[PDB]
Amino acid sequence: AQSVPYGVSQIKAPALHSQGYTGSNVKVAVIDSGIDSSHPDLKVAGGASMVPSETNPFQDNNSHGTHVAGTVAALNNSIGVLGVAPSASLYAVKVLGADGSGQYSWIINGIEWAIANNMDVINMSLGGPSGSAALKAAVDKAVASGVVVVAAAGNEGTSGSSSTVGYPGKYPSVIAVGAVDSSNQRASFSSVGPELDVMAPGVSIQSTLPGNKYGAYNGTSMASPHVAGAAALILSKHPNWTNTQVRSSLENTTTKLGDSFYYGKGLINVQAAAQ
Numbered sequence: 001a002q003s004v005p006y007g008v009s010q011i012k013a014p015a016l017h018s019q020g021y022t023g024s025n026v027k028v029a030v031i032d033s034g035i036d037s038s039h040p041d042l043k044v045a046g047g048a049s050m051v052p053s054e055t056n057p058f059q060d061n062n063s064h065g066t067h068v069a070g071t072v073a074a075l076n077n078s079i080g081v082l083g084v085a086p087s088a089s090l091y092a093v094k095v096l097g098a099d100g101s102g103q104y105s106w107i108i109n110g111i112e113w114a115i116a117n118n119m120d121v122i123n124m125s126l127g128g129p130s131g132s133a134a135l136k137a138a139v140d141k142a143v144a145s146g147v148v149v150v151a152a153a154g155n156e157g158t159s160g161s162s163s164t165v166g167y168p169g170k171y172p173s174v175i176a177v178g179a180v181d182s183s184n185q186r187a188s189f190s191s192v193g194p195e196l197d198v199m200a201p202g203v204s205i206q207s208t209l210p211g212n213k214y215g216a217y218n219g220t221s222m223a224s225p226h227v228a229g230a231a232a233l234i235l236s237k238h239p240n241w242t243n244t245q246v247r248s249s250l251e252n253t254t255t256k257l258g259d260s261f262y263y264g265k266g267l268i269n270v271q272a273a274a275q
């Protein structure tokens, strides 16, 4: 028996699945800890590792990349969960080790791989407090190249009047995603600031874990893949739309939630965005 995690329903993904739009032929790169390609509820189309220590992107030592991957694209079958874009072509771009730590060079190499490999959407459920000119140039390049780039806003909460949006989420070319719960309430951990773009469900998100398991996690890393999945649904309905058009559609059709410093534009609604 399959279950639909609440976050998939919240963003109105089942409305698109009902129409027959499930993300088919859309290439999504999950730039994270790898994806357990053996999970019965996932199909991994390819990938590459950027970790010089761990060559196999298809082994997830951390769990994170597998959980993110299941929010984007857990298969529509009789088992497990359901992803936002269950027919999307998932690619595992390993940039983080078993510790969940990476190098900025590894991340940049993963972005570059995704551009060279004609990915449609990049998800980066990662962030740090410090950016780099090379990191900015990579995200900017991916955008200029036609990629939809989505990232977690960060789990820094509030800090006075300061923005707490991490990098690369802080860059204007990236869609930075904050986290709400099932009641549309911002999660206390969710980073804030002018650079926050949209919100998605990020509290108690059930998804796939390595070794044929399922579990729930909290974080803006869990909100991000809802938006990356949403961009894959939009492209499956409108394959001729640019990344610019996908982004605008998602930002312009949100359910407004509260002050933009805390909530950005509000909650994404894929049914409205898919127009």
Ligand SMILES: [Ca+2]
Pocket: 002, 041, 074, 075, 076, 077, 078, 079, 080, 081, 082
């Ligand atoms: Ca399933």
Ligand code: NA
Pocket: 169, 170, 171, 172, 173, 174, 175, 176, 195, 196, 197
């Ligand atoms: Na941003």
